[PDB]
Amino acid sequence: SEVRTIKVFTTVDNINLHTQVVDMSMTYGQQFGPTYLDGADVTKIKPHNSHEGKTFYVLPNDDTLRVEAFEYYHTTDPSFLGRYMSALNHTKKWKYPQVNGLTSIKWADNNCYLATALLTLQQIELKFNPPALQDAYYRARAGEAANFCALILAYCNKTVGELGDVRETMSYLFQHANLDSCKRVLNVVCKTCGQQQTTLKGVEAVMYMGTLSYEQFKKGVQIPCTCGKQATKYLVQQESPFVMMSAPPAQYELKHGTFTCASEYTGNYQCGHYKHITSKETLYCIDGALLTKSSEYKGPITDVFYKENSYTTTIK
Ligand SMILES: Cc1ccc(NC2CNC2)cc1C(=O)N[C@H](C)c1cccc(-c2ccc(CN[C@@H]3CC[C@H](O)C3)s2)c1
Ligand SMILES: [Zn+2]
């Protein structure tokens, strides 16, 4: 039969586009291997006329693309790009309303942990290392978050429709962000053992599991010693843009202007519901596209974020 062709562009990063000529007999998979158009999988689909001039994502099958993909995504996981496109295919159908001047996500496919994490990122000082996240985050901040939510799902290895833990998500995100200058100094005192001082850098310096209260962390918290007698661990110095204080969900009271934002978890382990509480002129509770205001909030809190620059203890 007659040989028909169109010109298209193939890419890994949507920065470097490569012109390709395609046969309208064969499928995209036959010609380039797995292929995607705005996340949809067209590997088994033959070219259409409307496809002419459009940009397609493909897998790296030569050194140029591999280098391009690594520089942009800072990963070599060969499933990464297929999971990103697979996820994006769903995240592009989500609605990202501006609630309180921050970008949220209308609830779908248990995205309540992603709404809350996205709302948190817009409230704390953070620079991602992978250009893919820098670029998607900047678009997200301005109300186009479908690529950011797709990359988060891809980086966190989560499927659409699966509920995730906000503390884990953020931890993964922190690992891909520049926190080299973040420092924390802890002191532990035991009447028997003595005083021991430890320094922490990066992600370890901005996160803590076992108390929501930044103030309690500075007074001291009780922890079990190696010896077995109770010991007091307290914060001596902290240099970071913020601190994330986590604990298993507990009835907690949040007071206006004593924190930046908090994750509220209702329900049971890995099958519950997240809400985002932020401190502005009053307390705002953001629940996807839903918003309510109050001067006071008691409820089950699991993460609390506090802004910070430089703290030093006046203890001893
Ligand atoms: C939602 C979710 C998804 C995935 C995972 N995956 C695991 C792999 N990494 C973690 C976790 C969770 C999770 O549920 N997290 C919450 C924070 C959480 C964390 C830890 C403990 C709990 C709970 C324990 C008991 C729970 C029910 N009771 C509430 C607690 C006191 C309130 O009065 C009522 S939740 C949850
Ligand atoms: Zn001890």
Side-chain angles (χ1 to χ4, degrees), residues 189-194 225-231:
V189 342
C190 201
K191 271 86 173 210
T192 58
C193 298
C225 192
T226 267
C227 74
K229 194 169 191 281
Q230 286 308 233

Side-chain angles (χ1 to χ4, degrees), residues 6-8 28 37 45 47-54 56:
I6 57 177
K7 283 261 182 92
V8 302
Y28 283 107
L37 176 65
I45 280 298
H48 289 215
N49 300 243
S50 64
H51 287 195
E52 176 142 64
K54 283 194 196 249
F56 294 93

Side-chain angles (χ1 to χ4, degrees), residues 163-165 168 248-250 265 267-270 274 300 302:
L163 175 67
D165 176 275
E168 207 198 359
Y265 192 81
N268 292 95
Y269 188 77
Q270 307 185 138
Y274 276 107
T302 190

Side-chain angles (χ1 to χ4, degrees), residues 113 158 163-168 209 247-251 265-274 300 302-303:
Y113 79 101
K158 286 261 138 33
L163 175 67
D165 176 275
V166 164
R167 176 177 157 255
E168 207 198 359
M209 185 57 147
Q251 284 289 131
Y265 192 81
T266 64
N268 292 95
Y269 188 77
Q270 307 185 138
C271 51
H273 185 37
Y274 276 107
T302 190
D303 319 309

